[PDB]
Design a protein around this nucleic acid. Structure first.
Ligand SMILES: [Mg+2]
Ligand SMILES: [Mg+2]
Ligand SMILES: [Mg+2]
Ligand SMILES: [Mg+2]
Ligand SMILES: [Mg+2]
Ligand SMILES: [Mg+2]
Ligand SMILES: [Mg+2]
Ligand SMILES: [Mg+2]
Ligand SMILES: [Mg+2]
Ligand SMILES: [Mg+2]
Ligand SMILES: [Mg+2]
Ligand SMILES: [Mg+2]
Ligand SMILES: [Mg+2]
Ligand SMILES: [Mg+2]
Ligand SMILES: [Mg+2]
Ligand SMILES: [Mg+2]
Ligand SMILES: [Mg+2]
Ligand SMILES: [Mg+2]
Ligand SMILES: [Mg+2]
Ligand SMILES: [Mg+2]
Lengths: 44, 98, 181, 136, 58, 91, 120
RNA sequence: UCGCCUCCUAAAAGGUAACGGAGGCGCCCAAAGGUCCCCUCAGGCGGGACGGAAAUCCGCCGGAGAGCGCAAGGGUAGAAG
RNA sequence: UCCCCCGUGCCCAUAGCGGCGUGGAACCACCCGUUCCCAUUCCGAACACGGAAGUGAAACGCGCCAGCGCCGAUGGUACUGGGCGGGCGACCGCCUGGGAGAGUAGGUCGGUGCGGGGG
């Protein structure tokens, strides 16, 4: 499903596409956001 | 074969091609787009007996002094069979920052 | 160690014997020994928790070297395993480890296969490369009945630096291989 | 017997690889005009010859029908026709040697290859022997 | 030659028939059943007409 | 097998065919001359003596060159030899 | 301790533990244990290795066994299938050989009954 | 049948049609992505305990005929495997 | 200034494969060991480090060979811009310029730069 990474209790959905049966479930990806550079970005 | 060719993944100029023999180590700055070897340095036909890590450091010192002898500061490492290791070219005098 | 007894017998008798046999022209022209590989086919990856990597430790305790699980290249549906992964055990023995393994093999293991009239000297054929199978894996001087669950027959292949088969024949027959004639 | 075929008409233009010489046997039918030689005309001429000189010699059919001749079943135009009305067709350009008879004498060969040319749709020459060769 | 190992301690190999092979293996004390001193050896079969000339004659 | 042949000096192969001449080359690794041998005699020469027998070309200037008839380009349609070239023998 | 071939018995009495070696039965196991000289009722989980090899020197060297015996039995069978003796034929198709009736019986030389038979 | 992709028809730039020929897509992948470092394929010949004639292993010949998630081309090991 | 060797490129098989002999003063490699760095889903086989006891045996270099390969002209057909005709047709013919592919003669196991090391 089309799932968007959020900055951790913050903004900046990062909008990836996960393959939910194959692993998901706290998708964690370091990512550069619009504000406050670099974070953890758990999905949805 | 050692078909490795960490040759042709070098298109930036001033290609420092090394050669780690069983006896010596050779090194030479080649120019690209006009293939002319600019400076070079052997190890055992320059200096110290076959303590090869230290003399491979010393051939690099001598080569970088030869490079600043004609003023070349940005280069690019080579010799695809490298495995960058105890054949050391941890140097000053060449601002590749290698 | 470095003074393997078979290695000493090689370096002190066999190389001058092959020199005085064939009329060689170089010390490196004599057939040296460089490879003893042991393969374990082992198509056993079914359900009900069929682990079967105890045989890897069994082979490691035989030879003295931990074998690698090798994933199947092609997937065929005749035997039901597929998609690469599951099992084939390989170990490769070079110098003194190969020599201590051949000291354990040629003198202790083969003399015993359950009948053992000999080896099969039609088996070299062109390269150096003497290959020989083993029906029962537990002829070796380490592992008897109470360390296994099933019979794990491997096959070894010893490779020489010999261009033909006659040269490797004359090498291994004096290293201690018997044959069938 | 293979790769997908309801293939196009082509065009029976100039003949150079379409026609070299007679290789097998002695005598040979050879075409003088480009035409489509069917499998039915191949079988018809060949069983004219083998039944003319009965239990005779070798009749090499050097052509081979490899082109699906297509015929619509008497209707309008929606796609290619169903294919292979009598079957396949050897595209034959002139100068091509179609049939060769081997070993059998000239009196049976000239009165066999003439029959083959009579069942073929092409005006033909009949060559004797001693054509193009290469060996030293 | 890495971290994991079988550690290959020197090991005499006694046999039953008396031959000792000084080799390298795991489990440094090892003795076996048969090694050399079984090389060309025991009972060979008595042939056909030999036994049938043994059994009877007229 | 002797045979008379002339010297083409680069004069229009289709005009030689119009004349009835069979054009050709006389060639080896020593010489290379375009020729025309007359076809109304070359057919009688060549169907008698094949490519296994040594022809000898007599030229307009004396030369009775030994040769092997090397290759014939047939006319693909309209059956006749269309070009010849002669492997001239070497000494 | 293995004895012959590889055939190792454990935790059993020795004079029937020898029977698991092919070619040794109950009678030879009675005989060639006290013949060498061993108490024939010592459980082989505790058999002295000197007595194991003093037993094995009589086991292997005296009579032929698994392999050299087994193979001569099979070679006797292949020798019997020669041109057609009556005992080598019917080894050749598995029927019995020493006077067995086969009209109803012989399920240990035949099979699995293939019951394809029967009238109407 | 209606959109998209691959050839071909397409006439050696491109484009080009028909209810012309022949196939596919409506996805997938947190490693089948990035980078660093290694390694070479399929096949055939032999030789090898169960082992299919192609499991796994060894040795030669193997320059791409293997692979690249998927159709088809283009490409490609001096990697895209 | 020339051959010898080492790297490094260019043209990309006219230099490749397979042969057939030669090389070891150096160079280069094999080797001798795994303590040292780092190593291999196992294996210092590879990679790497230490060494220099021995050897050119492989590998490589350098020569001869045409067997395979590769290149391959002169011609001449094919094909064809352009023109002009014949053919109810399938298609063909002539002139004008181009002009192959295969084939045949043959050519061919390098050529060439750059920096080192050596008589
Ligand atoms: Mg949704
Ligand atoms: Mg380089
Ligand atoms: Mg009876
Ligand atoms: Mg186009
Ligand atoms: Mg990828
Ligand atoms: Mg095999
Ligand atoms: Mg096998
Ligand atoms: Mg591929
Ligand atoms: Mg798909
Ligand atoms: Mg492609
Ligand atoms: Mg070249
Ligand atoms: Mg040769
Ligand atoms: Mg020589
Ligand atoms: Mg020297
Ligand atoms: Mg090298
Ligand atoms: Mg050599
Ligand atoms: Mg050509
Ligand atoms: Mg040409
Ligand atoms: Mg050559
Ligand atoms: Mg050359």
């Amino acid at each position: 499903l089309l799932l968007e990474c959020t900055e951790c209790k913050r903004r900046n959905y990062a909008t990836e596409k996960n393959k939910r049966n194959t692993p998901n479930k706290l998708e964690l990806r370091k990512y550069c956001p619009w504000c406050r550079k670099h974070t953890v970005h758990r999905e949805v | 074969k050692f078909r490795v060719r960490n040759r042709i993944k070098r298109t930036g100029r001033l290609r420092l091609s090394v050669f780690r023999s069983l006896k010596h180590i050779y090194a030479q700055i080649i120019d690209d787009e006009k293939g002319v070897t600019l400076v070079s340095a052997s190890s055992l036909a320059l200096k110290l007996k076959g303590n090869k890590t230290e003399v491979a450091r010393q051939v690099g010192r001598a080569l970088a002094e030869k490079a600043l002898a004609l003023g070349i500061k940005q280069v690019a490492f080579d010799r695809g069979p490298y495995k960058y290791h105890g054949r050391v070219k941890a140097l000053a005098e060449g601002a590749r920052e290698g | 160690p470095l003074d393997v007894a078979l290695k000493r017998k090689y370096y002190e008798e066999v190389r001058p014997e092959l020199i005085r046999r064939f009329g060689y022209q170089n010390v490196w022209e004599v057939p040296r020994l460089e490879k003893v590989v042991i393969n374990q086919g082992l198509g056993e990856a079914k359900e009900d928790a069929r682990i079967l990597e105890k045989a890897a430790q069994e082979l490691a305790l035989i030879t003295g070297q931990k074998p690698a699980v090798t994933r199947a290249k092609k997937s065929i549906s005749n035997f039901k395993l597929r998609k690469g992964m599951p099992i084939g055990l390989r170990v490769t023995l070079r110098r003194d480890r190969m020599w201590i393994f051949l000291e354990k093999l040629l003198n202790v293991a083969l003399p015993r296969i359950r009948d053992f009239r000999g080896l099969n000297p039609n088996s070299f054929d062109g390269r150096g490369n003497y290959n020989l199978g083993l029906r029962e894996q537990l002829i070796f001087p380490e592992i008897t009945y109470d360390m296994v669950d099933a019979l794990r027959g491997m096959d070894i292949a010893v490779v020489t630096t010999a261009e033909t088969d006659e040269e490797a024949r004359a090498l291994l027959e004096l290293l201690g291989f018997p044959f069938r004639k | 017997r293979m790769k997908y075929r309801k293939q196009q008409r082509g065009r029976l233009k100039g003949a150079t690889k379409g026609g070299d010489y007679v290789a097998f046997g002695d005598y040979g039918l050879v075409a003088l005009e480009p035409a489509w030689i069917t499998a039915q005309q191949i079988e018809a001429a060949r069983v004219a010859m083998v039944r003319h000189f009965r239990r005779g010699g070798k009749i090499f059919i050097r052509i081979f029908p490899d082109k699906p001749y297509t015929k619509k079943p008497l209707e309008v135009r929606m796609g290619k026709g169903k294919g292979n009305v009598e079957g396949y067709v050897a595209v034959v350009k002139p100068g091509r040697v179609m049939f060769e008879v081997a070993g059998v004498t000239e009196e049976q060969a000239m009165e066999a290859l003439r029959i083959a040319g009579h069942k073929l749709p092409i005006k033909t020459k009949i060559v004797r022997r001693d054509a193009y060769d290469e060996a030293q | 030659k890495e971290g994991i190992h079988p550690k290959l301690v020197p090991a005499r190999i006694i046999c039953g028939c008396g031959n000792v092979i000084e080799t390298y293996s795991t489990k440094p004390e090892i003795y076996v059943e048969v090694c050399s001193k079984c090389h060309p050896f025991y009972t060979g079969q008595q042939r056909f007409v030999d036994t049938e000339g043994r059994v009877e004659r007229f | 097998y002797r045979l008379k042949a002339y010297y083409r000096e680069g004069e229009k192969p289709s005009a030689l065919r119009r004349a009835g001449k069979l054009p050709g080359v006389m060639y080896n690794r020593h010489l290379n001359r375009k020729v025309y041998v007359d076809l109304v005699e070359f057919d009688k020469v060549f169907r008698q003596a094949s490519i296994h027998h040594v022809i000898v070309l007599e030229l307009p200037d004396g030369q009775s060159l030994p040769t092997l008839v090397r290759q014939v380009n047939l006319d693909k349609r309209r059956r006749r030899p269309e070009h010849v070239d002669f492997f001239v023998l070497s000494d | 301790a293995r004895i012959a071939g590889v055939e190792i018995p454990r935790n059993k009495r020795v004079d029937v533990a020898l029977t698991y070696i092919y070619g040794i039965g109950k009678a030879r196991a009675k005989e060639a244990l006290e013949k060498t000289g061993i108490n024939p009722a010592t459980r082989v989980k505790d058999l002295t290795e000197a007595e194991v090899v003093r037993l094995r020197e009589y086991v292997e060297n005296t009579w032929k066994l698994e392999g050299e015996l087994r193979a001569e039995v099979a070679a006797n069978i292949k020798r019997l299938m020669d041109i057609g003796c009556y005992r080598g034929l019917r080894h050749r198709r598995g029927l019995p050989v020493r006077g067995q009736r086969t009209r109803t019986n012989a399920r240990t030389r035949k099979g699995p009954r293939k019951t394809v038979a029967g009238k109407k």
